[PDB]
Amino acid sequence: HWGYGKHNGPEHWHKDFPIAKGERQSPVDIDTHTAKYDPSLKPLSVSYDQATSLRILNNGHAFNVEFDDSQDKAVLKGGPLDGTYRLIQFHFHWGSLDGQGSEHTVDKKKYAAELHLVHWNTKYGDFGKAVQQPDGLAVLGIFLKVGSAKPGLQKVVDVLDSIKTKGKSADFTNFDPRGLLPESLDYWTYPGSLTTPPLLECVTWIVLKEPISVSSEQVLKFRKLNFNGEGEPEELMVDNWRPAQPLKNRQIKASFK
Ligand SMILES: N#Cc1cccc(-n2cc(-c3ccc(S(N)(=O)=O)s3)nn2)c1
Ligand SMILES: [Zn+2]
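^ thats the input. predicted complex w/ X0Q below
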């Protein structure tokens, strides 16, 4: 089906998902000199104190840590958003080498990986409805660079060997996503899309300026994951990122100067 290889990767997605060539696709390069500071932007509110994680899943494209979103336990508000967006899952995109991996780029710089905290607009009632709306999702994007270890990531790294292959899951309760955030919440924002099929144009992207540092040992363990199912030939889960797409008729706004 779709994936990230030569024969089914991003340059092929458009044949099944014509919106791949649409007017508001993600990711994009963030040109920091042309992004405009917007005083209209209220401060971001990340309220993850009551977050309830449940499970971690290898879905054959990435791994997802899933949250209980049956009530407003972990939400994103403020910044460019109106209303309340509920955390449903986070996941990452990463490279085969430390010079690549992120989806968004900053003045053409690629980071080693990129974290996506995925939230849906509660006025649409459920995720599947929210994705059919231009303001249905808000994804908080955070770059990772390789340096010192991120203590708050290590519980995730340590469960990966239990979900090596596609379709494997493990219990993942009592995980605190506040441990993945950098100190600053300064951000860029723009309207865009899911960066995987079905590439729906339903996302308010909020990308943090400050990356988090992770260790080489941490990132290496992401790279031991498998795209394949158990008992199939091993294909390492690496380079599961989509490259930057045309900005078209969009302006990236900055919360800071
Ligand atoms: N409920 C539900 C449900 C069922 C199937 C899939 C999903 N679901 C899909 C996604 C996403 C696909 C791409 C992204 S991305 N890389 O953040 O733009 S998030 N996030 N949750 C959610
Ligand atoms: Zn993603």
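The domain at 1-257 is CATH 3.10.200.10 (Carbonic Anhydrase II).
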